[PDB]
């Protein structure tokens, strides 16, 4: 654990949120998981693809419950989910970037790891 940093916040919440079955990876699953009321925290990176699905993610996080966090560097959150489960995700064979995520369920509520977003929601 860390000191509430954004570059620790994603790493901290992710590692419990895979176990809590929360991550709609990819863009179509993010959309389909936002059209139902299961979503909680949404993530996007820099543009390496369509210059309008960025507009898609911000419009969708906007239209119901504003909760977005933006963090660039697609390959980083990619490698943080870099293989289908937690062992050798750093295996360079496959290291696809997510370029979007929706957390449904943000892990076991703990250790201020969710409070980092509470420190942003009405503050930013």
């Amino acid at each position: 654990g860390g000191v509430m940093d954004v570059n620790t916040a994603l790493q901290e919440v992710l590692k419990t949120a895979l176990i809590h079955d929360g991550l709609a990876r990819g863009i179509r699953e993010a959309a389909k998981a936002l059209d139902k009321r299961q979503a909680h925290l949404c993530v996007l990176a820099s543009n390496c693809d369509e210059p309008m699905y960025v507009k898609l993610v911000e419009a969708l996080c906007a239209e119901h419950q504003i909760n977005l966090i933006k963090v660039d560097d697609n390959k980083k959150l990619g490698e943080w989910v870099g293989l289908c489960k937690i062992d050798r995700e750093g295996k360079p064979r496959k290291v696809v970037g997510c370029s979007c995520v929706v957390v449904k369920d943000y892990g076991k509520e703990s250790q201020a790891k969710d409070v980092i977003e509470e420190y942003f929601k009405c503050k930013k």
């Binding site: 176990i19 489960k85 937690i86 062992d87």
Partner: protein
Amino acid sequence: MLMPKKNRIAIYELLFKEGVMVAKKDVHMPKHPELADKNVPNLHVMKAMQSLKSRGYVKEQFAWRHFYWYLTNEGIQYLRDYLHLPPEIVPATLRRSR
């Protein structure tokens, strides 16, 4: 698909809870009996254990139409990884046998 991830995990957790698996050699029966019975066809159980055995992890016997699968140490470790358990828990088999 070879089977749904839901079905895989349901089979693996049962094997870990007990420590040993059994199914008759039959691809047609619609549900496995036992604690998979609400959900899973035993074709999936056979097909799953075959992959598990080819990677160590399991010992296999077959006598009058019925597989008997034991979980070995490598299997304990891999399943303890794959299911994210308290890294020291095993309800499979724990008592000194007199």
